[PDB]
Amino acid sequence: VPATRILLLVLAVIIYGTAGFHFIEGESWTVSLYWTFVTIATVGYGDYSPSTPLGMYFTVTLIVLGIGTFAVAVERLLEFLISRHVVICGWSESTLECLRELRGSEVFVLAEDENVRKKVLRSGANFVHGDPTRVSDLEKANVRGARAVIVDLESDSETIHCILGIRKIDESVRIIAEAERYENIEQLRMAGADQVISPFVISGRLMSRSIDDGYEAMFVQDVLAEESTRRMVEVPIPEGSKLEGVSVLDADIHDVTGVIIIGVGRGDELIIDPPRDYSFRAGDIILGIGKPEEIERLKNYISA
Amino acid sequence: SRHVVICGWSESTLECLRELRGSEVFVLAEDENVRKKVLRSGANFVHGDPTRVSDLEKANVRGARAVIVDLESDSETIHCILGIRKIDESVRIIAEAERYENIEQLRMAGADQVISPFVISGRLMSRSIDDGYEAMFVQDVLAEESTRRMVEVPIPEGSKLEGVSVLDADIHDVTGVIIIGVGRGDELIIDPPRDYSFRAGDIILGIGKPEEIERLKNYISA
Amino acid sequence: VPATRILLLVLAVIIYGTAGFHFIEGESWTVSLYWTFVTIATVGYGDYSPSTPLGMYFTVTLIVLGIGTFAVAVERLLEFLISRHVVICGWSESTLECLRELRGSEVFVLAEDENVRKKVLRSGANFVHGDPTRVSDLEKANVRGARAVIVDLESDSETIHCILGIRKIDESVRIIAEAERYENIEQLRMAGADQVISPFVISGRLMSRSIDDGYEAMFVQDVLAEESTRRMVEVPIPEGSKLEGVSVLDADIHDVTGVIIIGVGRGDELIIDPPRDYSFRAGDIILGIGKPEEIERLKNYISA
Amino acid sequence: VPATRILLLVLAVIIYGTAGFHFIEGESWTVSLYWTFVTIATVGYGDYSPSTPLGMYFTVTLIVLGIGTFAVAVERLLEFLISRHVVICGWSESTLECLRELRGSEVFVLAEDENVRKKVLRSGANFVHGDPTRVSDLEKANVRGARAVIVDLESDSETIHCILGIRKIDESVRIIAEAERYENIEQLRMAGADQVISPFVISGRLMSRSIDDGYEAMFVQDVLAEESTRRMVEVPIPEGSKLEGVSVLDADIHDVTGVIIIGVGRGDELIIDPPRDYSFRAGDIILGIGKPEEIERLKNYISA
Secondary structure, three states: HHHHHHHHHHHHHHHHHHHHHHHOOOOOOHHHHHHHHHHOOOOOOOOOOOOOOHHHHHHHHHHHHHHHHHHHHHHHHHHHHHHEEEEEEEOOHHHHHHHHOOOOOOOOEEEHHHHHHHHHHHHEEEEEEEEOOOHHHHHHHHOOOOOOOEOOOOOEEEHHHHHHHHHOOOOOOEEEEEEEOOOOHHHHHHEEEEOOEEEHHHHHHHHOOOOOOOHHHHHHHHHHHOOOOOOOEEEOOOOOOOOOOHHHHHOOOOOOOOOOOEEEEEEOOEEEEOOOOOOOOOEEEEEEEEEEHHHHHHHHHHOO | OOOEEOOEEEEOHHHHHHHHHHHHHHEEEEEOHHHHHHHOOOEEEEEOOOOHHHHHHHOOOOOOEEEOOOOOOOOHHHHHHHHHHHHHOOOOOOOOOOOOOHHHHHHHOOOOOOOHHHHHHHHHHHOOOOHHHHHHHHHHOOOOOOEEEEEEEEEOOOOOOOOOEEEHHHHHHOOOOOOEEEEOOEEEOOOOOOOOOOOOOOEEEEEOOHHHHHHHHOOOOH | OOOHHHHHHHHHHHHHHHHHHHHHHHHOOOHHHHHHHHHHOOOOOOOOOOOOOHHHHHHEEEEEEEEHHHHHHHHHHHHHHHHOOOEEEOHHHHHHHHHHHHHOHHHHEEEEEOOHHHHHHHOOOEEEEOOOOOHHHHHOOOOOOOOOOEEEEOOOHHHHHHHHHHHHHHHOOOOEEEEOOHHHHHHHHHHOOOEEOOOHHHHHHHHHHOOOOHHHHHHHHHHOOOOOOOOOEEEEEOOOOOOOOOOOOHOOHHHHOOOEEEEEEEOOOOOOOOOOOOOOOOOOOOEEEEEEHHHHHHHHHHOO | OOOOHHHHHHHHHHHHHHHHHHHHHHHHHHHHHHHHHHHHHOOOOOOOOOOOOOHHHHHHHHHHHHHHHHHHHHHHHHHHHOOEEEEEEOOOHHHOOOOOHHHOEEEEEEEOOOOOOOOOHHOOOOEEEEOOHHHHHHHOOOOOOOOOEOOOOOOOOHHHHEEEEEEEOOOOOOOEEOOEEEEOHHHHHHHHOEEEHHHHHHHHHHHHHOOOOOOOHHHHHHOOOOOOOOOEOOOEEOOOOOOOOEHHHHHHHHHHOOEEEEEEEEEOOEOOOOOOOEEEOOOOOOEEEHHHHHHHHHHHHHOO
C-alpha cells in the first residue's frame, strides 16, 4: 500500500478517535488527541479512559480500527527515516585489485549482478545496482561529480557503449577502460576513453619475453607493487624551479639524487629514455624509480 | 633452438604466439574449432586435454625448452603444472594466475615464473587516476615496434667489469643505456646501490636505443 | 539494517525521550529514563505520564518515533541471544551417503550452490556457503580444528586444489578425497590426501567380476551396509594384552572367538591374509568380520 | 527455533521477572508472577509497578529481555492451537481434459512445476508439489488408497520410472499410462501399466483415414463426447440373468432393444464384432452404443 495512503488512513483514525473521545467523554481536544495516540499505540497509561458505557463501546471500536492502522503506519515511517569520488562500472578481478589499491577514497560500484553486494561492501565500496550501459543508471551512480570512471565490462561492445554513455553525461570526466581484445584499442580510444589498459597484451608479451629468463616480468610485477624498496612515482616540476631550460645532460639527476629517470611526460605524451639535449620545462612530469629517501631528496632538489 | 609447447588457448597465448614468430610452437587444447586460428599463426596444433599426462606426452614436453600454461581456470593450471612436472622435472614452466591468492600455490606446484595479468591491470588502473605515465611506460616499453627497447645483456667471462662497481662503471654517460636492474640467478635487484660490484655471469637489464645497446655490448666485451 | 546501527538509533530515541520528559515534566533523570522505556515498549504503566500540553505533544512524538525503533531493536537483539567436527567440501551422492552414515556428530558442508541449503539442513548438517578452493572460505568452515575433511568436488583438478588449500591451512588434519580418474590417485596422494577412494575403479572391477556370478559385489555391498547381521569391525590390540608376541598360528582367533581374521594393519599399511609366522604386537589393528557376539568375545579375548 | 526451546526461554524470563520483582519490590510471589506477565505482554495495567530505582532499572532489563521472547512464544503457541480418490502424476493437456471429465470425484495432482497450482485448483483438484519419480513424493500423494493412478510425464523414461515407483508402493492399484512414442507401448506394459493410451498413434491413423472422407474421425470424436444423443457405455451381465448360455444369435439384442452391440469383453480381453455362436456368460461386459432410453431398456432386458 502506498505510504501516503497509509498516512491518510492513520490521520482519519486519529480524527475519529479524538472527536469521539471529546464528544463522548468530554475531555479537551488536546487531551482527546493525546488519549487517541496513547490508545492506538497500545501504550494505555490510564490517566484518561472512558467512564461511560458509550465511551467503552467507542473505545473498543477505536482499538479494533486503530491499532492495526497505527502499526502499519509506524512501520512505513521507519522506512523513510531509516578529492571527489571514483565510480567503477562492472565487477571483475581487475576492478577487485583496483578497489584493493583504492582504500581511503570513496568508491561507487555500478554492476548488474545483485549477488556481488557482499564482496563490494566488504572491500570498502558502496554498491549501486544497475546497468552500466543505460544513461539513467550511469547518472545515479554520480558520474557527473566523479574524478575518474573505471570501465571493465564483459566485452568490448559493452565497454564502448558505457564509454559513450559517460561521454553523453559528462564530457570532462576521466575514463579508464580495459581492452579485452587487441584490435579494439583504437576503437576504445575513439569512443572517448582517456587511457586503455590492455592486460592480455602485457601478459602475452611478458610470457613471450620470459622464455629465456624472466627478468622483465619480475621488474614489472615488482615495481608496480607498493611493497618493495623502490617505487615508481611521478614528481612534477613546479612553477618557478631551478630546472627550467636546463637539459638532462646539464642536470645529472641520477648523480646528485640517485633516482633513475626513465621518462619525462608532458600532457598526454611520454618519451622514455629522453636524449641529452632535451630541455626541461615547468610542468613536465618526471617518471622515476628510487627509494622514498631518494624521492624526498629529488623533491628537495627540484624545489622553487 | 628447440620447440615451445603452449597448453590452452586464450588471448594471452594468442599474443605470445604472435611474438614468437620465427620459432616452432606446439599448441595443446581441447577445442578442435581453434585449428585454423592456431595454424594461421604458424603453430602446430595438437588436440588433447592439457591436464592428462598422455595428451601431455603427445605434445613433446620432454624435448621442449619452455612450457606456457594458460588454461581456463587456476585449478586446471595447477593440475596441468603437476602433470608436466610428472614428465620432465627440469623444463621451464611459465604459468598465469587468474587470482592473486593462487600465486604461491602455482609456484609451489612447480612453475618457474608466474605472470598474473589481473593484478598488473588493477595496479595500472588504480595508478592512472591522476595521469597514466606508468601505464604508458609499461605498455610502450614492451611493444617490439618502439624506439627504445628493454633488453637483457649478459656479462661474459673475461670482461672489463669484473669487480667494478656501478658508480665507477658509469654506464649512462658513456653508453646511454638506462640501467634499471642487475639480475643474477633467480633474483633481480632493481636500482642497485653504488657499492654493487659486478660479477662475470650477471645479467644487466636496461633500456635504450639499439645503437646504445650495441655500444653497451661493445663496451662490456672481453 | 546492521544491528549496530539499530542500536545507535534506539539509544538516540532513549536520549530524546529521557531528556524531554525530564525537562518538560520535571521528573528525575532516572524516572525519565524508566518512563521512556515503559513508553516506547508500549507497556504504559501510567505511574508517570505527562501533565502539561507540551508534555502530551512531546509524548505523541516519542510514541511515533520510538515504538517502531524499539520494536526493530528488540527483534535484532533476539537474534544475538538466540568428538570434534567433520568438514565436507562439495555436495554429491557420495557425500550424501557419507552424511547418512555420519549421524550424531557435527558436520559442516561447504558448497558453492545456495539451493542445496535445505537438503543439507534436512540431512542433518550445518551449511556453510562458500568456495572450497578459496583458502578464506575454507578457514570460514573451521578446517583447523576438525578431525577429518572429506573432499569431493566436480572435477579432479578442483579436488587437488582444495587438498592443496587444506594443506596450506593445516598440516595435520586427515583428508579423504574421491578420484574421478585412475591417473590422479598418485597426484591426490602427493598433494596430501590421507586416503583416496576411487568409486569408478571399484565399480568397473565389480562389473567385470560380476559377469559369471556376482558374489563379490554381494559381499562388498553386504558387509558395508550397517543393516546386515555381520559387520566389518576394526578391533585394536591394547597395550599389555595377552597377545603381545604370539604368532597368528598359535593365537588361533577364529575357532576360539568366531570372527574371521581377513587382515591386520599397522600405521598406514595393511596385510591381507597374514601368514602364520606373523607375530602380533601392541597397537595393531585387527580387521575382522563377525556377529557382534563374536566381536564382543574377541574384545574380551584381547583384554589386558 | 524449535517450539520447545522457545518455551524454555520464556519460562526462564518468567522466573527472572517474578523473582526479581518479589525480592526488589517486596510483592508476593503470586503478584510478582502476574506483574511479570502483564509487563512482558506489554499490557502494563500499572496496578503494580516498581517504586525503587533498582526496581526501575530491573524493569527496563525485563522489558528488553522479555517482550521479544514473549512475542515469539505466543506466535509459536498460535501454531499448535490453530469411491476412493484418483491421483494424477504430471500435468499436460491430456490430464487437463481428464480432469475436466472427472468432476465430482476427489483428484490429487502430483507435478513438479509450482506455477500450475492456480489452474489445478481452478479445475477442481488438490495440488501436491513433488517429483512423480520419487517414491516419497509418490507416497505423499496417497497412491496407496487410490483407485487409479494416471501417469502422463514428459517422456517415456520418466513414465516408466513413475510406473515402477507406483508398483513399488502398491501392487494392486490401477495405472493408466500414456505413450509418447509407438515402440514404447510394450515396455510401458512390461513396467506395470494396466492400460497404455497412445494418442499420437490414434491421431496418425485418423489423419491417414481422413484423406478421402473423414467419417471415422467424426465417429470417434462424437461417441467419445458426452454431448451427443448416442453414448458408448458398458453394461455388465449380472449374476443370475436370463442370458447365461444364450448366444448372440439366439439373443438378437439389437432387435429387441435397439442398442448396437459392438463388442463383448471379459477380464482384460475384448472381441469386437463377436461371431454368432459366442455363448454369453455371467460377468461378460457388453460394450454398446445407443440412446439412454435404449440403455435403460437393455438394462431391463438383461435383468435377474
